[PDB]
Design a protein around this ligand. Structure first.
Ligand SMILES: *CC(=O)Nc1nc2c(OC)cccc2s1
Ligand SMILES: *CC(=O)Nc1nc2c(OC)cccc2s1
Lengths: 304, 304
């Protein structure tokens, strides 16, 4: 029993983090086989960041200007290229600690672990979600860029995020490992406002199932609802519309608890309309939306 | 910017987790040098757990009854002994992945990372605090016993917890790595109720400093207080009494923000008396008490 915001074990990713220095800019890179992946803005000064022309800035850069350091040993850069917003630095040595891995582009509402790194050294790990506005609410200080987000399926790391930007509102933007930004963000120090941070409805419901499973049941009520009726209330409270796809995804949690998805919807509807009245659910005073149904099943069943 | 509940990177501890099987009981062990540490109740059946005599149960056990498996390779047990509530299994092979480590017995209010393991395989990592009632609010399913809690200072793992027990109220009890229980708990399936779960006042204050640092300032007020006046309000709300030691520990956060500790106390006092009025602090609807002052400095300064 007990339900926690839980990150994947970080060991497999710790073994991939390097320091990348171009001129006087140092950030983190991901070393997989004989390639080091890092944000292309490693080539920028703070001046450059106001209006960078990356292709032009890159012409002034050779392999030997990219200093790659793995622990206290230097890697030899034998090639470099820009793919979207990342640089791929070919090194002469395959990372001996390369895990089985994939690059996946996640959808909003999907959760992943971040290994916060500074100077290629891991400082900590935490669980995030890709917000519906394609931001993440991270913990990222200067030097944190190139820190990655990942899921693990048994022994295979799926890398889904690389950290690039803080928005003036203190939320975070970055790319998949093909260097494509999540949402409309760019690696430019410019006016970039996030859209509405909507609540991931299917994740709240998943987490209400986790609560019932772990003994927190005070918010179960006598009501049901329909997707259309629920969705009217979702709209009002800036919750993502719930689809039949979400209902199907919650099927296993429905089965195990014996609470129909639409009944749990009715519980969520009353919680939105009435608030928590000073009560907590799994030690939270608000509705948690950064557990997926898959996360709840995993933690409630003990998958490794 | 951004402030997250952040665990230490788990790699150094992942490399220490083994499976320990005695008869039909399987749980996790910690392999440091040529010793495997595990809960002594690995020798118990569920029947045994109602009233175990461990010294008597142990006489029926030889080295070859303790099956230790590191990944898919078996370790040879060449000795065993009971120290308090842990078994120390001497194996013929030093763990090649042994990190620099210490065993530390933490005080209530101190935070640590847990690497949840099942069958010697890591499933996830999360941040805990030793509660003032010497419980922890973990996520621990069957097979989770022998999972450990730790802090990391640069390259040195300080192990402070090993998981032993779930209380019927769904909270968690365990030992330091000398096998001494935190609080009055025992490795017996008996009536064991936790005392008052008081709030760790110095940790809430630390986290209010983290909020100011990260831009959440709405709860700063025009008032100050004294330790004695604050403590009257703490008593009423089941908050730990604040000492001059706590004030001194908060000194660095005081300095960096320019908010005197006692002024932040006055902010906390108003929050206790008035509630949050439906507002959030660092994305929380309640006062977070599982960040230490040291945790806030570390995350706010980017230590690795
Ligand atoms: C996200 C992150 O760490 N960005 C960084 N940018 C710089 C920089 O830009 C001009 C100079 C020095 C270090 C860093 S880290
Ligand atoms: C905390 C934990 O995982 N305890 C376990 N106890 C047993 C047991 O006790 C009778 C039998 C089989 C497996 C486990 S794990």
């Amino acid at each position: 029993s007990g339900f926690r915001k839980m990150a994947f074990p970080s060991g497999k990713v710790e073994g991939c983090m390097v320091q990348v220095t171009c001129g006087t800019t140092t950030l983190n890179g991901l070393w997989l086989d004989d390639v080091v992946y890092c944000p292309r803005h490693v080539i920028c000064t703070s001046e450059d960041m106001l209006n960078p022309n990356y292709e032009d800035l890159l012409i002034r850069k050779s392999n030997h200007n990219f200093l790659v350091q793995a622990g206290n040993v230097q890697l030899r850069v034998i090639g470099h290229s820009m793919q979207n917003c990342v640089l791929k630095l070919k090194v002469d040595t395959a990372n001996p600690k390369t895990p089985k891995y994939k690059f996946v582009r996640i959808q909003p509402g999907q959760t992943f672990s971040v290994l916060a790194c500074y100077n290629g050294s891991p400082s900590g790990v935490y669980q995030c979600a890709m917000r519906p506005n394609f931001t993440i609410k991270g913990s990222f200080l200067n030097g944190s860029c190139g820190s990655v987000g990942f899921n693990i399926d048994y022994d295979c790391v799926s890398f889904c995020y690389m950290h690039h930007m803080e928005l003036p509102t203190g939320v975070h933007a970055g790319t998949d490992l093909e260097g494509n930004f999540y949402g409309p963000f760019v690696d430019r120090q410019t006016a970039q406002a996030a859209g509405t941070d909507t609540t991931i409805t299917v994740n709240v419901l998943a987490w209400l199932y986790a609560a019932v499973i772990n003994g927190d049941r005070w918010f179960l009520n006598r009501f049901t609802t329909t997707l259309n009726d629920f969705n009217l209330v979702a709209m009002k409270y800036n919750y993502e519309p719930l689809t039949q796809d979400h209902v199907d995804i919650l099927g296993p949690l429905s089965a195990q608890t014996g609470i129909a998805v639409l009944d749990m919807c009715a519980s969520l509807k009353e919680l939105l309309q009435n608030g928590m009245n000073g009560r907590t659910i799994l030690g939270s005073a608000l509705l948690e939306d950064e557990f997926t149904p898959f996360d709840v099943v995993r933690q409630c069943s003990g998958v490794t």
